[PDB]
Amino acid sequence: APDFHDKYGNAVLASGATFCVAVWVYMATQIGIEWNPSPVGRVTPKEWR
Amino acid sequence: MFINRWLFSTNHKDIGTLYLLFGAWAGMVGTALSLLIRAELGQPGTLLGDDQIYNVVVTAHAFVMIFFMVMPIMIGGFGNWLVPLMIGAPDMAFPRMNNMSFWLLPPSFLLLLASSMVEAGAGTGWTVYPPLAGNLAHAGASVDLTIFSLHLAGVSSILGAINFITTIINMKPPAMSQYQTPLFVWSVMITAVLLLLSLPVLAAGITMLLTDRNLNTTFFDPAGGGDPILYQHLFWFFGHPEVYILILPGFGMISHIVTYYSGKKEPFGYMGMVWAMMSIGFLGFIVWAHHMFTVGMDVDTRAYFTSATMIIAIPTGVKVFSWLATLHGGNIKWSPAMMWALGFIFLFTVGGLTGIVLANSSLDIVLHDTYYVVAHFHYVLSMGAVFAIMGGFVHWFPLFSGYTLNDTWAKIHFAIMFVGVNMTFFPQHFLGLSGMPRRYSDYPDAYTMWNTISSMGSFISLTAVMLMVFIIWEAFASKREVLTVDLTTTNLEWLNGCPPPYHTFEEPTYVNLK
Amino acid sequence: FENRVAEKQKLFQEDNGLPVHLKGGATDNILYRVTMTLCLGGTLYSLYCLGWASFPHK
Amino acid sequence: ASGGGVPTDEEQATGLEREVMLAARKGQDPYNILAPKATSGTKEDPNLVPSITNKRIVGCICEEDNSTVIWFWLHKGEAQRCPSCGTHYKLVPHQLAH
Amino acid sequence: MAYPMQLGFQDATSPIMEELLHFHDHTLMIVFLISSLVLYIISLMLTTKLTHTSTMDAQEVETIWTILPAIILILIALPSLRILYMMDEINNPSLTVKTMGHQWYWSYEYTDYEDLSFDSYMIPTSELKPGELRLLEVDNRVVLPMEMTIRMLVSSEDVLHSWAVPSLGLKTDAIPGRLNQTTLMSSRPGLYYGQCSEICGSNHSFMPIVLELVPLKYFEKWSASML
Amino acid sequence: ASAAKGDHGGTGARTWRFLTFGLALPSVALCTLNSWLHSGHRERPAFIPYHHLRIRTKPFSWGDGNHTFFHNPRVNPLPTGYEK
Amino acid sequence: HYEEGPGKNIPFSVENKWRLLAMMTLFFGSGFAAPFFIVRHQLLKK
Amino acid sequence: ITAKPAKTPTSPKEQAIGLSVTFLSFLLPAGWVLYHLDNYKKS
Amino acid sequence: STALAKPQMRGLLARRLRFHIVGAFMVSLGFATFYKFAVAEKRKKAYADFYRNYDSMKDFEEMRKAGIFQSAK
Amino acid sequence: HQTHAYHMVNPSPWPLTGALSALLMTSGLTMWFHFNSMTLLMIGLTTNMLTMYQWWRDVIRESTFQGHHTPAVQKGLRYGMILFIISEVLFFTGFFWAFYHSSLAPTPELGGCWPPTGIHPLNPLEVPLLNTSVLLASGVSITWAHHSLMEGDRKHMLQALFITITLGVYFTLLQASEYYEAPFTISDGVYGSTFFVATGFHGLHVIIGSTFLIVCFFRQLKFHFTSNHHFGFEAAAWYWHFVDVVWLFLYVSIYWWGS
Amino acid sequence: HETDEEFDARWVTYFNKPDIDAWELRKGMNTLVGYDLVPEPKIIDAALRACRRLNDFASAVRILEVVKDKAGPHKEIYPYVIQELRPTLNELGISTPEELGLDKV
Amino acid sequence: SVVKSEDYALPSYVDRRDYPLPDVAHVKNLSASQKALKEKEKASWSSLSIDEKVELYRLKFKESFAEMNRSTNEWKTVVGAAMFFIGFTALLLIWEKHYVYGPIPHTFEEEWVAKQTKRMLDMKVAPIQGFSAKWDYDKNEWKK
Amino acid sequence: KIKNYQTAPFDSRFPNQNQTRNCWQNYLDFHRCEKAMTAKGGDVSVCEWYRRVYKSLCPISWVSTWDDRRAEGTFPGKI
Numbered sequence A: 001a002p003d004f005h006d007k008y009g010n011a012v013l014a015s016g017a018t019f020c021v022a023v024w025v026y027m028a029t030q031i032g033i034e035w036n037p038s039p040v041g042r043v044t045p046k047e048w049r
Numbered sequence B: 001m002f003i004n005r006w007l008f009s010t011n012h013k014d015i016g017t018l019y020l021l022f023g024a025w026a027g028m029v030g031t032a033l034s035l036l037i038r039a040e041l042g043q044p045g046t047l048l049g050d051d052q053i054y055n056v057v058v059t060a061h062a063f064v065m066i067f068f069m070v071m072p073i074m075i076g077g078f079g080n081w082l083v084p085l086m087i088g089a090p091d092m093a094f095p096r097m098n099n100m101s102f103w104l105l106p107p108s109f110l111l112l113l114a115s116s117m118v119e120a121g122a123g124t125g126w127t128v129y130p131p132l133a134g135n136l137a138h139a140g141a142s143v144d145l146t147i148f149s150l151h152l153a154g155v156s157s158i159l160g161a162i163n164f165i166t167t168i169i170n171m172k173p174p175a176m177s178q179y180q181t182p183l184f185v186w187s188v189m190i191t192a193v194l195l196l197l198s199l200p201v202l203a204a205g206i207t208m209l210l211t212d213r214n215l216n217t218t219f220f221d222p223a224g225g226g227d228p229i230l231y232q233h234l235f236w237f238f239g240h241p242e243v244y245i246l247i248l249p250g251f252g253m254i255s256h257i258v259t260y261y262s263g264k265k266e267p268f269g270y271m272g273m274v275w276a277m278m279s280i281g282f283l284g285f286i287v288w289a290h291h292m293f294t295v296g297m298d299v300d301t302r303a304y305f306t307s308a309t310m311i312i313a314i315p316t317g318v319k320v321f322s323w324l325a326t327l328h329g330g331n332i333k334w335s336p337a338m339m340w341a342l343g344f345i346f347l348f349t350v351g352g353l354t355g356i357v358l359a360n361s362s363l364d365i366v367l368h369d370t371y372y373v374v375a376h377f378h379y380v381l382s383m384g385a386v387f388a389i390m391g392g393f394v395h396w397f398p399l400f401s402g403y404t405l406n407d408t409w410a411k412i413h414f415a416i417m418f419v420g421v422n423m424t425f426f427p428q429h430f431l432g433l434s435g436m437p438r439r440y441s442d443y444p445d446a447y448t449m450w451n452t453i454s455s456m457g458s459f460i461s462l463t464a465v466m467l468m469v470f471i472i473w474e475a476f477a478s479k480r481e482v483l484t485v486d487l488t489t490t491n492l493e494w495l496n497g498c499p500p501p502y503h504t505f506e507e508p509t510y511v512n513l514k
Numbered sequence C: 001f002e003n004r005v006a007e008k009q010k011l012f013q014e015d016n017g018l019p020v021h022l023k024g025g026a027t028d029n030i031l032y033r034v035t036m037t038l039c040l041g042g043t044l045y046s047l048y049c050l051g052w053a054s055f056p057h058k
Numbered sequence D: 001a002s003g004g005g006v007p008t009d010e011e012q013a014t015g016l017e018r019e020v021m022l023a024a025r026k027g028q029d030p031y032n033i034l035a036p037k038a039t040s041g042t043k044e045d046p047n048l049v050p051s052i053t054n055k056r057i058v059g060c061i062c063e064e065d066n067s068t069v070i071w072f073w074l075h076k077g078e079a080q081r082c083p084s085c086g087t088h089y090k091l092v093p094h095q096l097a098h
Numbered sequence E: 001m002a003y004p005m006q007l008g009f010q011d012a013t014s015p016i017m018e019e020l021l022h023f024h025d026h027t028l029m030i031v032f033l034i035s036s037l038v039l040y041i042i043s044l045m046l047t048t049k050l051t052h053t054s055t056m057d058a059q060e061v062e063t064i065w066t067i068l069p070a071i072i073l074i075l076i077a078l079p080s081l082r083i084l085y086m087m088d089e090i091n092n093p094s095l096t097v098k099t100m101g102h103q104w105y106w107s108y109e110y111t112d113y114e115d116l117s118f119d120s121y122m123i124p125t126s127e128l129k130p131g132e133l134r135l136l137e138v139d140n141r142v143v144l145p146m147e148m149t150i151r152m153l154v155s156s157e158d159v160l161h162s163w164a165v166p167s168l169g170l171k172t173d174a175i176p177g178r179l180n181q182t183t184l185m186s187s188r189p190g191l192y193y194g195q196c197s198e199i200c201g202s203n204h205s206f207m208p209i210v211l212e213l214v215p216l217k218y219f220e221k222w223s224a225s226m227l
Numbered sequence F: 001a002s003a004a005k006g007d008h009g010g011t012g013a014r015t016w017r018f019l020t021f022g023l024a025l026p027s028v029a030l031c032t033l034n035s036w037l038h039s040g041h042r043e044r045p046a047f048i049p050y051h052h053l054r055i056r057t058k059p060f061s062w063g064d065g066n067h068t069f070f071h072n073p074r075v076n077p078l079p080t081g082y083e084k
Numbered sequence G: 001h002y003e004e005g006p007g008k009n010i011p012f013s014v015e016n017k018w019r020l021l022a023m024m025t026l027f028f029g030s031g032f033a034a035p036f037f038i039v040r041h042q043l044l045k046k
Numbered sequence H: 001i002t003a004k005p006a007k008t009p010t011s012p013k014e015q016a017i018g019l020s021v022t023f024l025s026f027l028l029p030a031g032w033v034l035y036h037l038d039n040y041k042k043s
Numbered sequence I: 001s002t003a004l005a006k007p008q009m010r011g012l013l014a015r016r017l018r019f020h021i022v023g024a025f026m027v028s029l030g031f032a033t034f035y036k037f038a039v040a041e042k043r044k045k046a047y048a049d050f051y052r053n054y055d056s057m058k059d060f061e062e063m064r065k066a067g068i069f070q071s072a073k
Numbered sequence J: 001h002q003t004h005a006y007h008m009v010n011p012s013p014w015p016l017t018g019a020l021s022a023l024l025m026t027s028g029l030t031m032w033f034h035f036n037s038m039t040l041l042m043i044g045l046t047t048n049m050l051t052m053y054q055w056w057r058d059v060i061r062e063s064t065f066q067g068h069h070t071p072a073v074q075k076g077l078r079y080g081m082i083l084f085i086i087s088e089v090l091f092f093t094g095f096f097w098a099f100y101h102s103s104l105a106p107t108p109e110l111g112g113c114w115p116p117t118g119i120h121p122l123n124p125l126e127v128p129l130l131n132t133s134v135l136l137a138s139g140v141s142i143t144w145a146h147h148s149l150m151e152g153d154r155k156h157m158l159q160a161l162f163i164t165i166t167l168g169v170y171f172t173l174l175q176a177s178e179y180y181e182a183p184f185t186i187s188d189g190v191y192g193s194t195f196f197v198a199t200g201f202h203g204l205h206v207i208i209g210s211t212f213l214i215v216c217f218f219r220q221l222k223f224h225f226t227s228n229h230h231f232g233f234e235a236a237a238w239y240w241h242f243v244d245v246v247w248l249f250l251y252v253s254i255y256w257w258g259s
Numbered sequence K: 001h002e003t004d005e006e007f008d009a010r011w012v013t014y015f016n017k018p019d020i021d022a023w024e025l026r027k028g029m030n031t032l033v034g035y036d037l038v039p040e041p042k043i044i045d046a047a048l049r050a051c052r053r054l055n056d057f058a059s060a061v062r063i064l065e066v067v068k069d070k071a072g073p074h075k076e077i078y079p080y081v082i083q084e085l086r087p088t089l090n091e092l093g094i095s096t097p098e099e100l101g102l103d104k105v
Numbered sequence L: 001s002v003v004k005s006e007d008y009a010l011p012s013y014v015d016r017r018d019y020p021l022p023d024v025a026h027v028k029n030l031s032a033s034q035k036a037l038k039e040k041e042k043a044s045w046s047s048l049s050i051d052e053k054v055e056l057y058r059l060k061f062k063e064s065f066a067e068m069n070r071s072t073n074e075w076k077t078v079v080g081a082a083m084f085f086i087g088f089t090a091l092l093l094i095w096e097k098h099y100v101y102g103p104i105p106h107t108f109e110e111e112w113v114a115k116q117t118k119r120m121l122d123m124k125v126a127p128i129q130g131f132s133a134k135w136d137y138d139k140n141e142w143k144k
Numbered sequence M: 001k002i003k004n005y006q007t008a009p010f011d012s013r014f015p016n017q018n019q020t021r022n023c024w025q026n027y028l029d030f031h032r033c034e035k036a037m038t039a040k041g042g043d044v045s046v047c048e049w050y051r052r053v054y055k056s057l058c059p060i061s062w063v064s065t066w067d068d069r070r071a072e073g074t075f076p077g078k079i
């Protein structure tokens, strides 16, 4: 007889993956976290003195 | 009945269970302290306060994880439950003194929590070096309460080590030689020898620190002719053997778990595993000054400690390769305990290899007191001692309790923990190579990215620890009672059923000589 | 002196179900309660002292 | 230089210590201090395993110097064999009252 | 100094730091290879339904398991100890500088000729000038002559500290009652940073080291101006 | 060595008693005379307030905080010198 | 003698899963909360 | 290992309750302290 | 119809192990060649190239003119 | 009913009362050193003494009165006592290591010499040599006690054990008098620190070993020992030899070599 | 050690013992499948005839399943072995696991 | 049939591909027709029907090899649930950012970073490989 | 004899990382020399080398503490 995995396995895998990717992308990009990446290729140096 | 059974115990299984409960509660305390560490570091700036409250948290994190989680679970919990059953003994040799080793731990933990409540805490590092830990820079009671906490833990384990040595040497069946005892029993015996010899030297050193702080001695104070470096030698003469004490019973459980879920009757190369554990226990007493390569020692002393420290990789590699050879040709059962043991083999090997990097003093000049060392030891502690503990806890939980865990939940738990500890610690290698110091509450801005990821990792391991409590609740809530277990002919601790009766081996096993 | 060990062997082997620490009779009970009372009372007192010492004093 | 005054074990040992001392004098081992010597272990000449109940654990060290011991319950009735080497064992129950 | 997302060591500023980088490269490949050799046997052990569960003879394969690691350790130790003894060789310094650790700043003494000494404290974050580095800058830098062998002597007047500059491969603990020596030689002018490296109380994170390496004649005039 | 004494043949109380009264207690009696002979107070050295001696980094938990546990006024000066 | 068997060789009751949940919540929850309250205590002092 | 079916089956809904209460028992007290840190500090 | 031929039946696990331990070693030599070339050689060359005609006084003057020094304006 | 020879101990309150007595003594030393109060410490010393007394009482009840010390049990206790002595040897080694580290490399604060400037050591040929003869002598008289006991001689066992305890007390009184007479103190730099802490823990062990010998003396007066079964006396004799050997190392290292 | 032929001969003789008992049948098969080999047809043949003397049809079927299992992913091995056993299968009336539907998951 | 906890010391049944002939039969108690089928088994097996052979197999053993060795969908539940709880973790971290962490230091402001970056290039931070090596001091831009 | 003094030279009596005894020995030699020279009415200028070496090597606070202790009568080294 089908067990829990046969009946719900596909849904748990699809929704867990969807949710995980969505909430990590959101946390990573939408709430003000400063990752401080390399300036190389990204920052234009500006006069400081 | 309740007080006679649980406060007055002379029974090795119930005392084992007390140690497992105590060690699980300590593990929640050590986990919260590690999350406060990672919250402070998870963005640049100051979260809590300055380095004092921060290093009180770091200091307590280490002492709780070492002395109140790992040692009580591996030796008090699994050693008391399994050792007498694996040798067919009716109990430990000193069953009443065994209960005092247990009961000295709640008061030791109470002293450590009192140290952090009074004055400003002991913000010294778990090494407690003077003069920072002396009575000028750490005036008041906190560091003496830490010393006393360590004395009580020290007596508990020294008496425990006497009990295990005696029990393992004296209480086997008369036909069983020491070369017919299982590897976990050997690993406990060796760890108990290390405890017996190393703890008294730590007790001497922290007593000297105690009298420098309260009786006007000057062991470690140059004004009286003392030397702060003498404390470091006495402390690490204990502290190097201590890390082999933390991992050896883990090696012993990994050998059983790998053997069992490979469907084998025995681990590959048994006498080489015994030789490897005795050689690692022996060499682990002659290497301690690899913790002191920047203190200003002579070049030839640094050459000797670099070489003696590396040599431990030889017997240790014998054991890793012998675990691989035990998997070889197995009928592999992918149980959640097997996954913990496979994760142990791989993560312990990573951390052993960064240890090898550090053994080179010339490179250790630059890596010492940075996060490269923190990465080295959390790969052997948080992904070796912890993984061997979770491996042995899921493997033997049905023996201790009579109930089964849900294996799907336990595999999920393993998967989350494996992702969280690697995300936590792997980036700390980059922080160490690029120069971030240890014991810092904040860092120059360039170190932001890796600290942020490492702090995010620690929260994933928090989610794993919360789910572990739920999984244990689910097992006791559903009460699926064990019926049959595989391979009892080579795993004697299962043969009295689950859980075994209060008294086992009232009639000893029959073993002939021939 | 005379050897009265046989008397003590009979006393401690009497089949009365008592644990060894109480098998000498009522004086064992007294000494046990005195010990346990000082340990538990002293432990409460050590907690009170922690509570007192956990806060700064004028 | 002469007096006695110190009791002997014969006079004063008691409880289990005495039982073990009196049994050892008779060449008997009711408390399992000694390792039993194997028989040839065939079905006609099985290892005889005393017990005070209806079953006892046997550990079989199948060949000399094996580090692996094979463990199993031996029950009252017909001889059983070690599941690794086949050597035969048979339980002989008594009661320490027989 | 370190830069964002850095993976490995700061670029070498001294010949001995250069040596440590190539030695680290040599060691890390080994680490790589062993790590990967293990992951891989491991996965080889676990990916077949074929079995062989009867007793396996250990002696031949244990020879391989001990001798090849022993040889790998010797391949790491030989260049490791060459470097240890080379750094220890006599080198003839042209200058001696002392540094004393304190809670929480460093002092510096340059007393070969005159009585020159001063204190060196972290620039607080709210006083940084634009472009300066948070937790790393100091008010008084340790000016030193480039391309010259300098003896640094390190001690402390209170608790332990440790005086480190990762780009020069330097870390010497600062212990009261003891004078530890190390040598320093920069191949290049510039600013080279480090941070206190032994836990020393409330502001351990906040007592950094900045070396300013310049031509000898600039160093001499700076010295005279600091009297 | 072998000592210079000379006995054996099997094991005895008699012999260890002979060693107790014939060698061990005589040696104690001898050392007791040697001692009770070089005894009797020695002239105290001038006081010098050396900074590596008379350490006080925290008061002692008894008395006035400044006296050692087995303080002897005749031979143990305080950080400020011998008592008055 | 003492009770033997699953659920009886432990110093806490598993006879009711919800009372067990409460006790386990209090037990692990108190160990996890303690360091946060100690930090609060240290911050509040000075 | 083999075992009997659960004597007291814990249904998905009861698991969701045990899981939620267990997670809240760790999250709430720590969350309250950390939420109020500025209050403890800037006191 | 035709009979099936007799296949190898014995030592299948040993044979698979032999074959793969040799492939495992070959990676290691192949990876070692890459790691030496992509990292270690590249480093030696970056340092040798940087210092080959490096002018430390000229590097100093650029820094000095950029205003970075306390001791040199 | 067991058919092994090992001792299943009755459930006991003494492990808990001893653990609590350790909490009371350590929190008591803390309250003495920092809060000017001896109360907790006296209560923990009292409970510790009460615990020791009842626990070892019960071990005598279990053995001499109830017969549970079969040869297999006694053999375990032999190993236990040897292992304990080994751990006490390692504890003294930490203090010997401290002594040699400071004395072999005397720092400038001391005058760069050993003994430090301003230290006037005791003469090792006076009371220290006397103490050495006392403890060596008491190793001879305990060996006499041991052989008399094995030979079934009650009166000479008691006479030799009394002698051995009298010498233990003599050494303790001699040492107490030398501590009072010493012109240096525990606060006199690392010389006074090593001297008093190493000889002081050794004196505490002499007081422990002497108490243990007095326990054996009263049990012997009560006929508890047989000519073949007397492990408490053997253990106290091994502990007593240990205290003598530690004294010999202290005498040679600190009193003689370090003078 | 011994040749392959000698190994095989000793196992043939083990199962060919006329009065082999049930315990010895089980001990022999459960020991034999611990080795790194799939047993030759002539060994299987002797085990199947021991099943027959012990009036145990089910264990003959289980022996055929375990041959297939010991071959792992070498799917050519089991069909060759059944080919070689067909005269014995037919003489003793042993149905294979496939003919009984016992290969269905 | 029905295994009891009180049987743990007795030989027991196990489906294990490496222990194909377990120590006892899966079913020992027989019905009248099952007793008749065990008698029939003593005669030629060619006279047993396929259903009778299958019934003999299923008296002796619980599961076939193909049954006990079958693959399952469990990995979907494991991987999916682990991703769920990893996703839940990011909720905790969002909460912590919003309610626990304050503003990070002003040195991370865009203009500060531009200036600091130029000052790092002016002091030639890591000029051999790590940082300034990646800047083109001739063309005044990041190397391609 | 040898002006153009730059710093204290390598000294094979004190070849290791701990140089505390080098500072201390030079401090002692200097002061022992100066006592010798001011006793016999000779010239302290002959003690100059030890003075230069201890000034280069020794922390200012150690010299200062040792000079205070010489003045107080509590310097524990022999001069």
Ligand code: HEA
Binding pocket: B243, B244, B246, B247, B290, B291, B309, B310, B312, B313, B316, B317, B318, B320, B321, B348, B349, B350, B351, B352, B353, B354, B355, B356, B358, B359, B360, B364, B367, B368, B369, B373, B376, B377, B380, B381, B384, B385, E034, E038, E068, E069, E070, E072, E073
């Ligand atoms: C379980 C705990 C544990 C274990 C097992 C180890 C194992 C080792 N450790 Fe570790 N270590 C710690 C816990 C541990 N460590 C802690 C807590 C600290 C810091 C303490 C502090 O400051 O607070 C630390 C610090 C530490 C330092 C000090 C760094 C510094 O402060 O600057 C060093 C340096 O030598 C070191 C080295 C090693 C080595 C060589 C091993 C070796 O024993 C590992 C040997 C194992 C392997 C090598 C892997 C398996 C082998 C093979 C697969 C064979 C092939 C391999 C080769 C040929 C090399 N460790």
Ligand SMILES: CCCCC/C=C\C/C=C\C/C=C\C/C=C\CCCC(=O)O[C@H](COC(=O)CCCCCCCCCCCCCCCCC)COP(=O)(O)OCCN
Binding pocket: B151, B154, B155, B158, B199, B200, B203, B207, B210, B211, B215, F068, F069, F070, F071, F072, F076, J029, J172, J175, J176, J179, J180, J181, J182, J183, J184, J185, J186, J187, J196, J197, J199, J200, J201, J203, J204
């Ligand atoms: C005849 C010798 C026996 C000693 C009797 C005296 C009481 C102390 C008890 C003994 C314990 C011994 C070691 C503890 C350290 C110090 C005591 C050293 C011995 C001693 O008695 O030293 C005295 C100082 O005592 C002092 O400070 C006294 C301070 C007394 C309080 C001691 C508190 C310290 C307790 C720490 C113990 C921790 C143990 C750890 C066990 C490890 C677990 C595995 C010397 O007197 P002084 O006036 O300085 O000089 C003499 C001048 N005329």
Ligand SMILES: CCCCCC/C=C\CCCCCCCCCC(=O)O[C@H](COC(=O)CCCCCCCCCCCCCCC)COP(=O)(O)OC[C@@H](O)CO
Binding pocket: D012, D013, J052, J056, J057, J059, J060, J063, J064, J069, J077, J081, J207, J208, J209, J211, J212, J215, J224, J225, J226, J229, J230, J231, J232, J233, J235
């Ligand atoms: C003063 C300030 C605080 C310090 C407190 C310490 C004070 C002093 C304690 C002195 C120790 C007294 C020990 C008495 C033990 C009596 C019990 C006993 O001796 O029990 C014996 C067993 O030995 C046994 O358990 C062996 C028992 C082992 C005892 C170990 C004793 C040493 C303990 C020292 C504690 C060390 C502290 C270290 C400090 C760093 C009983 O077996 P038998 O003798 O064979 O008799 C049976 C025959 O009659 C049958 O025919």
Ligand SMILES: CCCCCCCCCCO[C@@H]1O[C@H](CO)[C@@H](O[C@H]2O[C@H](CO)[C@@H](O)[C@H](O)[C@H]2O)[C@H](O)[C@H]1O
Binding pocket: C037, C038, C040, C041, C042, C045, J035, J036, J037, J038, J039, J043
């Ligand atoms: C039956 C169960 C056992 C539980 C026993 C509980 C006893 C509780 C009573 C304690 O109260 C007292 O308060 C004193 C202050 O009021 C202090 O005395 C101490 O403190 C004084 C200064 O306060 C010193 O001068 C004294 O020497 C010193 O011993 C000390 O805290 C204690 O004596």
Ligand SMILES: CCCCCCCCCCO[C@@H]1O[C@H](CO)[C@@H](O[C@H]2O[C@H](CO)[C@@H](O)[C@H](O)[C@H]2O)[C@H](O)[C@H]1O
Binding pocket: B035, B036, B039, B462, H026, H027, H028, H029, H030, H031, H032, H035, L092, L095, L096, L099
């Ligand atoms: C390091 C491990 C822990 C990290 C993750 C913790 C995740 C937080 C779980 C929620 O904790 C609660 O969060 C509330 C806010 O969401 C707080 O309420 C606070 O905020 C509410 C909204 O402002 C007010 O209604 C409340 O009164 C006020 O207490 C509340 O006290 C706190 O228990």
Ligand SMILES: C[C@H](CCC(=O)O)[C@H]1CC[C@H]2[C@@H]3[C@H](O)C[C@@H]4C[C@H](O)CC[C@]4(C)[C@H]3C[C@H](O)[C@]12C
Binding pocket: C001, C002, D005, J154, J155, J158, J159, J162, J221
């Ligand atoms: C009364 C008693 C007789 C012993 C007995 O057989 O009961 C004797 C025998 C040996 C005696 C002891 C030993 O002779 C040694 C001691 C010698 C002292 O002069 C008296 C106390 C002393 C401690 C004695 C007291 C008492 O007279 C003892 C104990």
Ligand code: CUA
Binding pocket: E101, E102, E104, E160, E161, E162, E196, E197, E198, E199, E200, E201, E203, E204, E205, E207
């Ligand atoms: Cu100064 Cu850390």
Ligand SMILES: [Cu+2]
Binding pocket: B239, B240, B243, B287, B288, B290, B291
């Ligand atoms: Cu170490």
Ligand SMILES: [Mg+2]
Binding pocket: B294, B368, B369, E162, E197, E198
């Ligand atoms: Mg350090």
Ligand code: NA
Binding pocket: B040, B041, B042, B043, B044, B045, B046, B047, B441, B442, B443
């Ligand atoms: Na921070």
Ligand SMILES: [Zn+2]
Binding pocket: D060, D061, D062, D070, D082, D083, D084, D085, D086, D087
């Ligand atoms: Zn066998």
